[PDB]
């Protein structure tokens, strides 16, 4: 009753029919089947990051010409959980779906290579671990970049250091417009939780 | 919260900006939810307020 | 084949044979409203506290709320001055939507609880007394609480209501009537009739624009109830 | 001294100390309303049969009550002709004063019983059929009972309603909704919607001034109920 303050923490509860963990199994067994637990499992599913990427013919294009753009939006699960965390380790699987009006007077093919991060086009070589597909017989390019880093983990959008882990270079022959989808590899995981930034809603843009 | 900019002399754009609790921020990914909520209401008082 | 006499809640039938009744193939359980809350009985439902009155005192005071208890009461015009008057159980039954939940019953055997949540600042002192008097507006004039002296008012049953020592009181007003099991239809119940008296005037600094408040609240709920005979009426 | 957290029905408090509560000296028993009837719970109270409808048939008949079941239904204008339509549970909840006894609750998990007391003279024959169809006025037009043939009407669940063999039927209409635990506040429940069809026309002597009556009555009450979440509203 005296003049002062205490803390006396009270976890007082409302409705207390049954244990919560028991009803959640019974609720998902009749409504879902699938039981989503860990967000590490959502970095294994290939969500499409773009719908159209019109690549100019005969140019060794790094994916960082698209990754700097498409890590802002958070459309996929890699860049939407780029805001709840700070570090990451693990390689990024990429799949490329061809959507080109192909022409019979050419033999279309697709290459792929490695560059370290954030280098430009001409300042890297080409003999490395490669992969090749032929989109007449195989429209999907099934490529996984490994995790070849100097450091054990990487923060997002670092300082003036560059070329400290590896990523993809994408070479074609014809002006192939595609779909690009991605997720992390088997050992891709974030860490070091922070609080989340904001969200953006609908932009109907009424006149007055 | 609504952000109102200008485009022309008689047209504007009203973009909805939402706050995001980490419980809220995960739920935007998923469609249907079921969760036991929690709230910790704290009074910031002096020694003399009753 | 001859003996079809079945029993509902309070209802019995008399048929020639059991009238070839069909039913569910298997009574499988369905949606989980049973798993979210246990069923609240009608004796469980008349044990919920209700916010009845909200009494604010400022000292002050121009009004009657801080006229102290008179040492002597010489005449019925200068009766004993109080704060509020609760005429139980006719207050506790109407409030909280209870009377629209004990309709179609006849007799009641209740015990009214009374709790006072109190919340005042440390710079204010005073003391009150929460007395109850059965048949206080039915008996002859000299026997009521409002006509006796200060020693006679306080001698009634009740509890002290000091500010700084008591932030909650628990008083159990018993089943205090001569009639067995209170009538409800055409009700004129009003058996025990509660009061609230200030003994000392509420004290604070005599300079104003300071707002020395008190802010009492009253909670009431029934206990040890038995609700027995079914009827078709009720008073509105 | 620090821990004053007490629990009512559905209500908890938080005080500094236990506020010096006084009570009865000894809780002696009083008037014998407990010895006259046992207390009827709210799950016990929603199991009382109510007199809903009182259907009289004369053969007759100028009216629609003895148009027999159509062998074919070729168009929606010539829909299937019936006697009455009970749109459960919105009929059984309003009648018998039940809705003024399950106010301040939210969710309900009921099973509606239906009984038909029947009382006709021995010189009258006929047969009816008591079918129920869930979502009968919510689904598309072709799937309702009122649009199918006589073999399709009778193929719905129900019971025979012959006069001379059956003076009582017992039908258990189950909890037949997709929503868990029926909503009450802002209610548009109307899930299972009952019917009563005559198969054969009622038969009696064609000379009149004879009064060949039938006089059906309908009793309904709930079963296996669970009433869970407390609120402050309700629909009138």
Picking from C223, A179, C125, C36, the residue whose alpha carbon sits closest to that of residue D8 is C223
Q: Contacts from B42-47 at CB under 8 Å and sequence distance 24+?
A: B45/A5, B47/A3, B47/A4, B47/A5
Distance CA A174, CA A102 (A): 9
Q: Is B4 on the interface with C (CB under 8 A)?
A: no
User: How many angstroms separate the CA of residue B34 from the nearest CA in chain A?
Assistant: 8
Q: Is B36 on the interface with C (CB under 8 A)?
A: no
Distance CA A151, CA A140 (A): 32
Distance CA A10, CA A21 (A): 22
**How many C-beta neighbours within 10 Å does residue C202 have?**
23
Distance CA C120, CA C57 (A): 10
State the burial class of residue B48 (Cβ atoms within 10 Å of its Cβ: 0-12, 13-18, 19+): exposed
Can you give the residue ranges of every domain in chain A?
1-208
Distance CA A20, CA A129 (A): 51
Residues of chain D contacting residue C225, judged by C-beta atoms under 8 Å apart:
39
* Inter-chain touch A23–C165, beta carbons under 8 Å: no
Distance CA D41, CA C227 (A): 10
* Alpha-carbon torsion, ordered A135, A136, A137, A140, to 10 deg: 20
* CB pairs < 8 Å spanning B and C: 6
Looking up tokens 């006679």 gives: C152
Residue C54 in contact with residue C215, Cβ under 8 Å?
yes
Q: Which residues contact C209 (CB under 8 A, 6 or more apart)?
A: none
**How many C-beta neighbours within 10 Å does residue C145 have?**
19
Helices of type H across chain C: 42-45, 150-154
Q: Is A203 on the interface with C (CB under 8 A)?
A: no
Strand partners, C222: C112
β D111-118/D216-223 pair status: antiparallel
**How many C-beta neighbours within 10 Å does residue A7 have?**
6
Q: Contacts from B38-45 at CB under 8 Å and sequence distance 24+?
A: B45/A5
- Of B6, B32, B34, which to mutate for an interface test with A (greatest number of A Cβ within 10 Å)? B34
Please report which helix (H) or strand (E) contains residue C193, including its range: strand C192-195
Distance CA A177, CA A53 (A): 5
Q: What are phi and psi of C171, to 5 degrees?
A: -120, 135
Distance CA A71, CA A79 (A): 5
Q: Which residues contact A33 (CB under 8 A, 6 or more apart)?
A: none
Distance CA C169, CA C132 (A): 14
Distance CA C195, CA C45 (A): 26
**How many C-beta neighbours within 10 Å does residue D228 have?**
21
Looking up tokens 């008996």 gives: C139
Method: cryo-EM
Residue C38 in contact with residue D188, Cβ under 8 Å?
no
* Inter-chain touch B15–A203, beta carbons under 8 Å: yes
In this structure, what DSSP letter does residue C227 have? B
Chain breaks in chain C (C to N over 2.5 A) after: none
Picking from C77, C70, C170, the residue whose alpha carbon sits closest to that of residue C130 is C170
- Of C1, C2, C6, C9, which to mutate for an interface test with D (greatest number of D Cβ within 10 Å)? C9
Region of residue D20 (phi > 0: left; psi between -120 and 50: alpha; otherwise: beta):
left
Looking up tokens 């998902």 gives: A28
User: How many angstroms separate the CA of residue A36 from the nearest CA in chain D?
Assistant: 23
Q: Is A205 on the interface with C (CB under 8 A)?
A: no
Q: Is C164 on the interface with B (CB under 8 A)?
A: no
Helix (H, G, I), strand (E, B) or coil at A41: helix
Count the helix, strand and coil residues of chain C and give each as a percent rounded to the nearest 5.
10, 25, 65
Region of residue C155 (phi > 0: left; psi between -120 and 50: alpha; otherwise: beta):
alpha
Q: What is the largest CA-CA distance in chain A?
A: 93
In this structure, what DSSP letter does residue C38 have? -
Q: Where are the beta strands (DSSP E) in D119-215?
A: 125-129, 132-134, 160-162, 170-173, 182-183, 192-195, 197-203
Q: Which residues contact A123 (CB under 8 A, 6 or more apart)?
A: none
Nearest residue of A to residue C164, measured between CA atoms: A1
CA angle at D105 for the pair D100 and D109, rounded to the nearest 5°? 100
β A140-144/D107-108 pair status: unpaired
CA angle at C106 for the pair C100 and C110, rounded to the nearest 5°? 80
User: How many angstroms separate the CA of residue C28 from the nearest CA in chain B?
Assistant: 25
Residues of chain B contacting residue A203, judged by C-beta atoms under 8 Å apart:
13-16
Rg (CA), chain B: 20
Nearest residue of C to residue B49, measured between CA atoms: C121
In this structure, what DSSP letter does residue D164 have? T
Within 13 Å, how many C-alpha atoms sit on residue D168's CB side? 16
Distance CA D228, CA D236 (A): 20
* Inter-chain touch C36–A17, beta carbons under 8 Å: yes
Distance CA A149, CA A154 (A): 9
User: How many angstroms separate the CA of residue C124 from the nearest CA in chain D?
Assistant: 18
Q: Order of strands, edge to edge, in the sheet holding D50-55?
A: D50-55, D216-223, D111-118, D170-173
For the record, the structure tokens of D222 come out as 């709930």
Which chain C residues have any C-beta within 8 angstroms of a chain A C-beta? 32, 34-38, 122, 164-165, 167
Looking up tokens 């609080």 gives: A195
Picking from C106, C101, C112, C91, the residue whose alpha carbon sits closest to that of residue C223 is C112
Residues of chain B contacting residue A84, judged by C-beta atoms under 8 Å apart:
22, 25
Please report which helix (H) or strand (E) contains residue B26, including its range: helix B22-27
State the burial class of residue B14 (Cβ atoms within 10 Å of its Cβ: 0-12, 13-18, 19+): middle
Distance CA B39, CA A184 (A): 35
Q: What are phi and psi of C65, to 5 degrees?
A: -70, -10
Count the helix, strand and coil residues of chain A and give each as a percent rounded to the nearest 5.
10, 25, 60
* Alpha-carbon torsion, ordered C100, C11, C186, C188, to 10 deg: -70
Cis peptide before C61 (omega within 30 of 0): yes
* Inter-chain touch D2–A12, beta carbons under 8 Å: no
Residues of chain A contacting residue D17, judged by C-beta atoms under 8 Å apart:
1
Cα A9 to chain centroid, rounded: 41
State the burial class of residue A114 (Cβ atoms within 10 Å of its Cβ: 0-12, 13-18, 19+): middle
Give me the residue from B14, B17, B45 closest to A198, CB to CB: B17
Residue C204 in contact with residue C123, Cβ under 8 Å?
yes
Residue D82 in contact with residue D146, Cβ under 8 Å?
yes
CA distances (Å), C178 to each of C138, C140, C187, D25, D31, in order?
A: 13, 17, 15, 19, 9
Distance CA C18, CA C21 (A): 7
Contacts of C among chains (3+ CB pairs under 8 A): A, B, D
Q: Which residues contact D8 (CB under 8 A, 6 or more apart)?
A: C47, C48, C49, C221
Distance CA A185, CA A104 (A): 36
User: How many angstroms separate the CA of residue A17 from the nearest CA in chain D?
Assistant: 9
Distance CA C203, CA C127 (A): 10
* Inter-chain touch B17–A199, beta carbons under 8 Å: yes
Looking up tokens 């019979």 gives: A104
Residues of chain C contacting residue D36, judged by C-beta atoms under 8 Å apart:
107, 181, 228-229
Host domain of residue C212: 1-236
Distance CA C61, CA D66 (A): 80
CA distances (Å), D206 to each of D67, D129, D212, in order?
A: 16, 24, 10
DSSP state string for A53-83:
EEPPSS--EETHHHHHHHTTS--SSTTTTTS
Per-residue burial over D201-227, b = 16 or more CB atoms within 10 Å of its CB, e = otherwise: bbebeeeeeeebbbebebbbbbbbbbb
Q: Contacts from C184-187 at CB under 8 Å and sequence distance 24+?
A: C184/C102, C184/C105, C184/C106, C184/C107, C184/C108, C184/C234, C184/C235, C185/C106, C185/C231, C185/C233, C185/C234, C185/C235, C186/C235, C187/C90, C187/C235
Distance CA C105, CA D38 (A): 12
Q: What are phi and psi of A81, to 5 degrees?
A: -95, 15
* Inter-chain touch A10–D5, beta carbons under 8 Å: yes
Helix (H, G, I), strand (E, B) or coil at C66: helix
Within 13 Å, how many C-alpha atoms sit on residue C29's CB side? 7
State the burial class of residue B19 (Cβ atoms within 10 Å of its Cβ: 0-12, 13-18, 19+): exposed
Which chain D residues have any C-beta within 8 angstroms of a chain A C-beta? 2, 5, 12, 14, 16-17, 228-229
Residue C195 in contact with residue C169, Cβ under 8 Å?
no
Domains identified in chain D, total number: 1
Cα B27 to chain centroid, rounded: 13
Picking from C40, A134, A208, the residue whose alpha carbon sits closest to that of residue B4 is A208
Residues of chain C contacting residue B50, judged by C-beta atoms under 8 Å apart:
119-122
Picking from A118, A119, A186, A182, the residue whose alpha carbon sits closest to that of residue A147 is A186
* CB pairs < 8 Å spanning A and C: 16
Distance CA A26, CA A23 (A): 5
Residues of chain A contacting residue D16, judged by C-beta atoms under 8 Å apart:
1
Count the helix, strand and coil residues of chain D and give each as a percent rounded to the nearest 5.
10, 25, 65
Residues of chain B contacting residue C121, judged by C-beta atoms under 8 Å apart:
48, 50
Looking up tokens 């079963």 gives: D223
């Amino acid at each position: 009753i005296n003049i002062g303050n205490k803390t006396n923490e009270n976890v007082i509860s409302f409705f207390d029919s049954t244990d919560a963990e028991t009803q959640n199994h019974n609720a998902l067994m009749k409504g879902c089947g699938e039981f989503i637990v860990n967000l590490r499992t959502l970095l294994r599913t290939f969500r499409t990051i773009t719908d159209n990427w019109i690549l100019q013919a005969n140019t060794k294009t790094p994916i960082t010409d698209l990754t700097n753009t498409t890590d802002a939006q958070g459309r996929d699960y890699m860049s939407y959980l780029s805001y709840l965390y700070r570090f990451y380790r693990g390689g990024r699987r990429y799949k490329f779906f061809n959507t080109t009006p192909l022409k019979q007077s050419q033999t279309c093919y697709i290459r792929s290579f490695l560059i370290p991060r954030n280098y430009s086009a001409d300042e890297i070589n080409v003999d490395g671990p490669s992969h090749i597909t032929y989109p007449v017989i195989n429209p999907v390019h099934e490529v996984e970049v490994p995790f070849y880093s100097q450091y054990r983990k990487i923060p997002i959008a670092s300082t003036s250091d560059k070329g400290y882990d590896s990523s993809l270079m994408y070479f074609s022959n014809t002006a192939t417009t595609q779909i690009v989808a991605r997720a992390g590899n088997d050992d891709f995981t974030f860490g070091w939780m922070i609080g989340p930034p904001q969200l953006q809603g609908e932009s109907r843009s009424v006149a007055p | 919260s609504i952000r109102t900019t200008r485009i022309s002399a008689t047209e504007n754009r009203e973009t909805e900006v939402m706050d995001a609790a980490p419980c809220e921020y995960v739920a935007n990914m998923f469609s249907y939810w079921r969760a036991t909520m929690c709230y910790r209401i704290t009074v910031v008082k002096t020694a003399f307020h009753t | 084949s001859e003996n079809s006499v079945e029993t509902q809640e309070i209802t019995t039938f008399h048929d020639v044979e059991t009238p070839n009744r069909i039913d569910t193939p298997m009574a499988q359980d369905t949606s989980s409203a049973r798993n979210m809350d246990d069923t609240h009985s009608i004796i469980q439902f008349l044990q919920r506290p209700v916010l009845i009155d909200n009494i604010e005192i400022i000292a002050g005071t121009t009004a009657d709320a801080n006229k102290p208890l008179s040492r002597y009461v010489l005449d019925q015009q200068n009766s004993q001055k109080y704060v509020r008057s609760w005429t139980l159980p006719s207050t506790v039954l109407r409030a909280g939507g209870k009377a629209q939940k004990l309709a179609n019953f006849k007799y009641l055997r209740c015990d009214v609880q009374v709790k006072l949540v109190l919340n005042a600042n440390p710079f204010v002192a005073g003391r009150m007394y929460l007395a109850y008097s059965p048949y206080d507006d039915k008996v002859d004039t000299a026997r009521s609480v409002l006509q006796t002296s200060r020693a006679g008012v306080t001698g009634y049953p009740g509890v002290e209501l000091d500010f700084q020592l008591d932030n909650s009181v628990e008083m159990t007003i018993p089943y205090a009537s001569f009639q067995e099991a209170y009538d409800l239809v055409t009700g004129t119940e009003d058996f025990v009739q509660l009061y609230l008296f200030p003994i000392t005037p509420v004290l604070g600094p005599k300079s104003e624009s300071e707002s020395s408040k008190v802010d009492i609240s009253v909670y009431m709920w029934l206990s040890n109830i038995s609700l027995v005979i079914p009827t078709y009426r009720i008073n509105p």
